[PDB]
Paper text:
[name]-4 proteins are expressed in the plasma membrane and form Ca2+-activated Cl- channels by assembling as pentamers. The channel comprises five [name] subunits arranged symmetrically around a central ion pore that is ~95 Å long. The diameter of the pore varies along its length and contains two constrictions, the ‘neck’ and the ‘aperture’, both of which are lined by hydrophobic amino acids. To address these questions we determined a series of cryo-electron microscopy (cryo-EM) structures of chicken [name] with and without Ca2+ in activated, deactivated, and inactivated states that represent the major gating transitions of the channel.
We find that the [name] mutation (BEST1345 [name]) produces channels with dramatically altered gating. Whilst BEST1345 [name] retained normal Cl- versus K+ selectivity, the [name] mutation constitutively activates the channel, making it nearly insensitive to the presence or absence of Ca2+. To understand the molecular basis of this behavior, we determined cryo-EM structures of BEST1345 [name] in the presence and absence of Ca2+ at 2.7 Å and 3.0 Å resolutions, respectively. Remarkably, in the absence of Ca2+, and in spite of missing density for Ca2+ and a disordered Ca2+-clasp region, the neck also adopts an open conformation. Modeling of the [name] mutation on a closed conformation of the channel introduces a void behind the neck, which we hypothesize energetically disfavors the closed conformation.
Residue numbers in the entry:
A (entry chain C), B (entry chain B), C (entry chain A), D (entry chain E), E (entry chain D): 28 to 299, 306 to 339
Write the structure that this text describes.
């Protein structure tokens, strides 16, 4: 939080100490008494601004939407267990057939993470970077851009997947219709999880609810630039009986009320190590359909037999 | 929120400054002292109205019902992956057969969004506008209005869908019974999601719970038209030691307590870009069952082979 | 809320103005000073009763159980899509066979709504009213009451349903075993939703948690019959510096703290237009298995073909 | 709550009135002034103990775990609809075969409710009481106790169930493999619901979180034995201007803060009428597989035919 | 909580009594008056630190993530019911075949619990301890470490499982394709539950949200080392009218605000008796596929027959 509060905090340190130096050195004595009345006014009536109430529900919606995206991580490990076993063949066709199926299922999640996450988007700026990272063969790029559509194209590989499995069934690679439908029902589970992330980016927390909660924090501490001044102890106002030149508890109070504001900036749109997550789901999925197709260990007895 | 608070806010600015001009220019000195006693009374006892408690749970129910409708967006991308692959045929019959199936599944969500959303309803005022936008052929409109029913008719295409797939199976287009049941089980998932939006419009947040929370905000600031007046500083009441002619912190306090009231007016009934969402789900679904039926890219090797 | 607060509110108006007339006209001057000490005592120490804390969680459980019953509305539209297509036959047997299946599935929800809802129970007082409304033939009523069971009998039609579909399969009306199991798996989804409403009536919010929250509201305002009196302004107590003869902010405070109590009486047991919901689910379900069995519109081309 | 607060409440009535009689009759006048200083100290500084904050989240976890167990009630009505229809046979074997299947599915929930509920455990103290109540034949008791296992044995009938259905399939009682798998997939739903109750008893709310919230209530009112004393009105302390000999609002404040503590004792471990629930699920399940196997009513026409 | 608060509590007892002894014995009388002004300053302005607000939501996220992991306990009892019945064979091959399937399904949860739980990790430090506990034969360890992968390897047995069942089907041990797919669909449910625990360890509660809530507790009671001092009663400050040498209510206030901090340290990463849970899921799963394959009790009549 110290990195996120290097900008807004030191402005508030600067905006306080400016006004503190102006009051102590620049104002005439007749004009200081004008400042003392506004300082007593803004100290008692800045509690009318519901800072703990407005900011309290905005964290209850940034985070309750933040947690709903980590049940939305598309793991290919459910399709991987069924492509590895059912799509038969050890020759260079069926070995190529299984690697293509688990490459489309990962491409159906890279094309959505490069529109919701800046970390993936700086790894894959254009579509040419997807080809050079092995997620798309050059012959698939020509078919990807003859399909003229002004919308997002993350649904392209999840239709190529389901058309390849049926083509795989009609050549005898998948045995029955039930084993074919078992793959397609696990495609549409990963299509739902990828379909959530597209739905969460397109449906943000509304602008009407963000512009409210950023005034309630800033207009509070705008009044605290005046209402938290150390007044003159010679006038002996009730409450300001001591001069200390640094408001310790005001700067702590700005640290937390603006702290949740900078936290909720972060958690409204996460994924700002998906560079690691994509490198896992590609390296595992191609591993478990090529090296582990029928390579099983040897069946032997356990330590509990008779 | 500034657009939503152009009406209620400037009335409250007008209702304050009217009474402020009446007290400062119209009341006699004997009658001003009558006003000063009511101003001190309504300042101390307007805190008895639980504004932060009544409004606190109404936002907890407008929004917790608002978020439950965005898991209810009917996406056709689960039926689209199975109509594209299983319903065989490249001739002009099966090409027409697949386009009809994905047109009924989109029509089973336009007919529910034109009764829950004013944006869709101004795009489709009558049923004639649905025909001219290609969602319904003219021969389907005659069958749509011989079915005499006083209720909503959004369930009509989702029965025409399931009767067409079985007619498609009996002509040999779908291979097995499992692949037929795989389509119908994914119909009834989109029928459940469309069934939620019909259930959410018919079950609103009750009138007994809205009429409570709109008195608690308005009757508070009705007392704040009197209890927040800048009194005469010559009388030297405790608290009103300064005249400033504009209550800054009261107008901020009205900005947030009526702010959540106008936000909860918006989020109790959302969809007031479904004009874009309908144009996506029609343009994608007809694309992936006509241009992408067996048009697959050429299988080649990846960048990780040996 | 005005209809629900016609009884408890006017008692509280009467109980206040009685004591206000007794203090102003009946008590002797020596006995008025005894009343002034109890009024100051009950004004400062009635804040010890946690009204906003006890009532705050009871609304958090009435409503969080209220919202869980509207995902429990049994819609027959999932069984209707599969009875309409799979149960073949156009003769007067299979036409009678499909209407019987969708009549048992609606009877398996009327028999549970006539034990959880007073609105349905006044429409169907006895079992004879169910026969005259067409939900049960007279020959089914004799079989319904030879089954001797002291418990609820809402599970009777959902077993008659699953025994009729298997009898329908053995006569050749349903084609395969998968299409039979597709109907029975959608029966057991509607059996779960009807099974929730039976579980919610049998498991109420406990008596130990309702008797707490109805003392905390009533014993608060029992003290507010004394602690909110307008005292004599001649004695000049701190706080009671003005006589106004009507406590406006106390009557508003009773309007909301007893307001949530009457709201939570309503939402602990909803359905007190299920007379419309039953008339929809019967009129739609019999419509879509008799008039819409194989009556499909004519396949023609859309407005986007070449 | 009056039954649950007969023990802790009257101790607090006794502990108050003891100290009240000691202060008024036993202490010397010099020693009373020592007591008056501690009474003023414990009145102002007992508000530092966060009673409304510590107890506020413990109710938010007792009840949020309490409500998650009533979606965990194992209803046999999903298996009952499939055993009644698919397991064929009207002779004394298949009649015995269906009754055994629905008896194992109820025994797979009695053996878990006799370890989580004291009400079931006093009905079934040992395993011999299960035999005499008809839930287990004497020949099944010998096989139940040759299976040597130090853990809980509630999973024993749910494996005997799935081994009997496959034995039923190999004798021709169940027709296809899909109808066999339809029973086993509905077994594993009731195995999950019974698996929740075993998981909820084994994972309690931790001891580190219960010992916190029982100090915060008791150490508060331990200070309220001193801080709520009616002091001497002759000394004229601020606040204690009246002697009344019974603290009405303190005893109400103890009624609710200890009220939620006794409520959360009840709802952390419910089921302390499962004697009725077990008698329902046995009497219904054996009824709907013996009297209602193919006993259907006669098909006749409804009141809406032509 | 007493064990968890042996470290931080006695430091706070020591840090208080140090400053209390310094003020009472070391400071000069002119320097004591400097301390009295800071004690009055830190007593009134330490309430500006939102301790009950910052810590209130951190418990709402530690625990709401804590409860979501106990629906994530991988129970093998759903696969166990289907391996026991469908994988046929009583000879020493099929007896070895069923024990291997339920050993891979337990190994697919030990390899994830030895990276998320320190209790399992001290039981299984290296992979050699897994072999000596019977969870992995020595021939499986060579195949486990030829699969070169820098990521976690918990997905290895859940692919060996699905490759063994298909190898079991092609030798005639499993009858149909539906019974094969019934096992694989229950594998991918246990793969999802094991997939949650890997997702919960990799996605912790962020460092930006923990470093906030540990300053708000500690910087509060850092000021309470000064603001809670018993001042000199001879100076007669308002509030400090009594010397007692031990702040009872401050030490209680530190007991709960730091109490939730130490509780949330525990519940952010639970499983710190999984040594019992692993010993159950191995001893039960191998028991119900070897001793209970077709060993059923003898079918006899119940106590309710005619």
């Amino acid at each position: 939080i110290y990195k996120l509060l290097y900008s807004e905090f030191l402005i508030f340190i600067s905006l306080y100490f400016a006004i503190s130096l102006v009051y102590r050195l620049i104002l005439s004595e007749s004009q200081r008494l004008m400042f003392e009345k506004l300082a007593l006014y803004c100290n008692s009536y800045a509690e009318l601004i519901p800072v703990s109430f407005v900011l309290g529900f905005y964290v209850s919606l940034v985070v309750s939407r933040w947690w709903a995206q980590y049940e939305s991580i598309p793991w290919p490990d459910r399709i991987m267990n069924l492509v590895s076993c059912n799509v038969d063949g050890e020759d260079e066709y069926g070995r190529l057939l299984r690697r293509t199926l688990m490459r489309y299922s990962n491409l159906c999640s890279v094309l959505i993470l490069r529109s919701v996450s800046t970390a993936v988007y700086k790894r894959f700026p254009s579509m040419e970077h997807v080809v050079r990272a092995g997620l798309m063969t050059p012959e698939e790029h020509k078919k990807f851009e003859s399909l003229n559509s002004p919308h997002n194209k993350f649904w392209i590989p999840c239709v190529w997947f389901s058309n390849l499995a049926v083509k795989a069934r009609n050549e005898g690679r998948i045995r029955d219709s039930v084993l074919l439908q078992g793959i397609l029902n696990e495609l549409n589970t990963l299509r739902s999880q990828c379909g959530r992330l597209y739905g969460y980016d397109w449906i943000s927390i509304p602008l009407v609810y963000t512009q409210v909660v950023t005034v309630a924090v800033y207009s509070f501490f705008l009044a605290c630039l005046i209402g938290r001044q150390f007044l003159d102890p010679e006038k002996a106002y009730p409450g300001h009986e001591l001069d200390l030149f640094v408001p310790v508890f005001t700067f702590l109070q700005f640290f937390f009320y603006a702290g949740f504001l900078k936290v909720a900036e972060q958690l409204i749109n996460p994924f700002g190590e998906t560079n690691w997550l994509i490198d896992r789901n590609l390296q595992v999925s191609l591993m478990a359909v090529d090296e582990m197709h029928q390579d099983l260990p040897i069946l032997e007895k356990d330590l509990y037999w008779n």
